[PDB]
Design an enzyme around this catalytic site. Structure first.
Site, PDB file in Angstrom:
ATOM      1  N   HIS A  41      52.693 -43.915  59.789  1.00 52.75           N
ATOM      2  CA  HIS A  41      51.682 -43.367  59.249  1.00 52.75           C
ATOM      3  C   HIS A  41      51.191 -42.060  59.957  1.00 52.75           C
ATOM      4  O   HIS A  41      51.881 -41.790  61.102  1.00 52.75           O
ATOM      5  CB  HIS A  41      50.670 -44.125  58.722  1.00 52.75           C
ATOM      6  CG  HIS A  41      49.690 -44.704  59.875  1.00 52.75           C
ATOM      7  ND1 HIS A  41      49.970 -45.936  60.438  1.00 52.75           N
ATOM      8  CD2 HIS A  41      48.626 -44.400  60.372  1.00 52.75           C
ATOM      9  CE1 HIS A  41      48.977 -46.244  61.338  1.00 52.75           C
ATOM     10  NE2 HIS A  41      48.400 -45.259  61.352  1.00 52.75           N
ATOM     11  N   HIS A  78      48.368 -41.212  61.798  1.00 50.50           N
ATOM     12  CA  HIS A  78      47.485 -41.132  63.126  1.00 50.50           C
ATOM     13  C   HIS A  78      48.278 -40.797  64.216  1.00 50.50           C
ATOM     14  O   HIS A  78      49.480 -41.196  64.184  1.00 50.50           O
ATOM     15  CB  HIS A  78      46.793 -42.415  63.066  1.00 50.50           C
ATOM     16  CG  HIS A  78      45.482 -42.575  62.009  1.00 50.50           C
ATOM     17  ND1 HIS A  78      45.212 -43.830  61.793  1.00 50.50           N
ATOM     18  CD2 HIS A  78      44.833 -41.897  61.338  1.00 50.50           C
ATOM     19  CE1 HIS A  78      44.614 -43.764  60.538  1.00 50.50           C
ATOM     20  NE2 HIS A  78      44.171 -42.524  60.393  1.00 50.50           N
ATOM     21  N   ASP A  83      48.508 -42.550  67.227  1.00 56.20           N
ATOM     22  CA  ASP A  83      49.579 -43.558  67.703  1.00 56.20           C
ATOM     23  C   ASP A  83      51.020 -43.677  67.044  1.00 56.20           C
ATOM     24  O   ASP A  83      51.938 -44.257  67.372  1.00 56.20           O
ATOM     25  CB  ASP A  83      48.995 -44.911  67.917  1.00 56.20           C
ATOM     26  CG  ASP A  83      48.487 -45.633  66.380  1.00 56.20           C
ATOM     27  OD1 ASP A  83      47.958 -44.614  65.589  1.00 56.20           O
ATOM     28  OD2 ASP A  83      48.193 -46.662  66.472  1.00 56.20           O
ATOM     29  N   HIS A 102      45.548 -49.981  55.647  1.00 56.65           N
ATOM     30  CA  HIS A 102      44.915 -49.524  56.860  1.00 56.65           C
ATOM     31  C   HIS A 102      44.569 -48.021  56.290  1.00 56.65           C
ATOM     32  O   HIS A 102      43.619 -47.408  56.686  1.00 56.65           O
ATOM     33  CB  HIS A 102      45.976 -49.542  57.975  1.00 56.65           C
ATOM     34  CG  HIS A 102      45.722 -48.664  59.294  1.00 56.65           C
ATOM     35  ND1 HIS A 102      44.749 -49.405  60.114  1.00 56.65           N
ATOM     36  CD2 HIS A 102      46.158 -47.644  59.632  1.00 56.65           C
ATOM     37  CE1 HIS A 102      44.768 -48.539  61.399  1.00 56.65           C
ATOM     38  NE2 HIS A 102      45.537 -47.440  60.819  1.00 56.65           N
ATOM     39  N   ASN A 147      38.397 -50.196  63.428  1.00 59.04           N
ATOM     40  CA  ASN A 147      38.887 -48.836  62.763  1.00 59.04           C
ATOM     41  C   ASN A 147      39.089 -48.760  61.372  1.00 59.04           C
ATOM     42  O   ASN A 147      40.378 -48.891  61.111  1.00 59.04           O
ATOM     43  CB  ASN A 147      39.720 -48.317  63.722  1.00 59.04           C
ATOM     44  CG  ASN A 147      39.822 -46.906  63.231  1.00 59.04           C
ATOM     45  OD1 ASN A 147      40.502 -46.349  62.557  1.00 59.04           O
ATOM     46  ND2 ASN A 147      39.091 -45.994  64.401  1.00 59.04           N
TER      47      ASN A 147
END
Ligand SMILES: C=C(C[C@H]1O[B-](O)(O)c2cc(OC3CNC3)ccc21)C(=O)O
Ligand SMILES: [Zn+2]
Ligand SMILES: [Zn+2]
Length: 231
Positions: A83, A85, A87, A148, A179
């Site tokens: 995905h 983000h 990280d 998420h 988060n």
């Protein structure tokens, strides 16, 4: 014995073998006054190495390629980002710099660019609707619906029944959510349903952060999410 956040200085990388030709990579980063561990996946494709997810950083990632060559000796030729983000796409420029063809869905590419994140080079088609799946080398790729984040994908290695959940899957010891400014909390357990139905045999289950487990983690994750929600 699996590595833990306190064994890994920031900017260093470890490798943990799960099964022949299947490893996880671990690294550690700072995110507001604290340092967290992060997981990823490496799967052998014959003479070449498939990467899932970066090491959280252009720096950590340069150090990921170092430890792959030292410890494995093969060339990373393709990487997939689960995905959008940092990280997961942070390090994708280093990767491209150093020879990698980098892939992620078109949802991921568009969201990374709106956000200000690094962008994968090549689109992954066939993953636009809940429950879609596509083969991609020695792994299967699965979009189970929003959770998420809206674009999160998981990755299964049939040769070894390893299931990689990314950040949609929490480890056992994690009791709160934290988060979720981009989750679809409402949709999230329906998306874990699809994963459970779709890979009910999985022997190994890897979360975005922390300690591996089994399918127990899918229940464990479903529960944490419905708690956040009932409060
Ligand atoms: C451990 C975590 C946080 C981890 O999860 B994530 O959505 O993959 C993520 C993104 C991120 O990006 C930063 C860069 N600007 C905001 C930082 C940290 C995380 C957790 O338990 O969820
Ligand atoms: Zn995330
Ligand atoms: Zn994460």
């Amino acid at each position: 014995a699996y590595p833990t956040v306190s064994e890994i200085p920031v900017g260093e990388v470890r490798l943990y073998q799960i099964a022949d030709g299947v490893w996880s990579h671990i690294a550690t980063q700072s995110f507001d006054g604290a340092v967290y561990p992060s997981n990823g996946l490496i799967v052998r494709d014959g003479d070449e190495l498939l990467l899932i997810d970066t090491a959280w950083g252009a720096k950590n990632t340069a150090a990921l390629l170092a430890e792959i060559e030292k410890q494995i000796g093969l060339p990373v030729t393709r990487a997939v980002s689960t995905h959008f983000h940092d990280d997961r796409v942070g390090g994708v420029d280093v990767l491209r710099a150093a020879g990698v063809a980098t892939y992620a869905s078109p949802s991921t590419r568009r969201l990374a660019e709106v956000e200000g994140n690094e962008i994968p080079t090549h689109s992954l088609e066939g993953l636009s609707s809940s429950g879609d799946a596509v083969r991609f080398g020695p792994v299967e790729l699965f979009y189970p619906g929003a959770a998420h984040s809206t674009d999160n994908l998981v990755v299964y290695v049939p040769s070894a029944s390893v299931l990689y959940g990314g950040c949609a899957i929490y480890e056992l010891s994690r009791t709160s959510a934290g988060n979720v400014a981009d989750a679809d909390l409402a949709e999230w357990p329906t998306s874990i349903e699809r994963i459970q139905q779709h890979y009910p045999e999985a022997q190994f289950v890897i979360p975005g952060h922390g300690l591996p487990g089994g399918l127990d983690l899918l229940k464990h994750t479903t529960n944490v999410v419905k708690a956040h929600t009932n409060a």
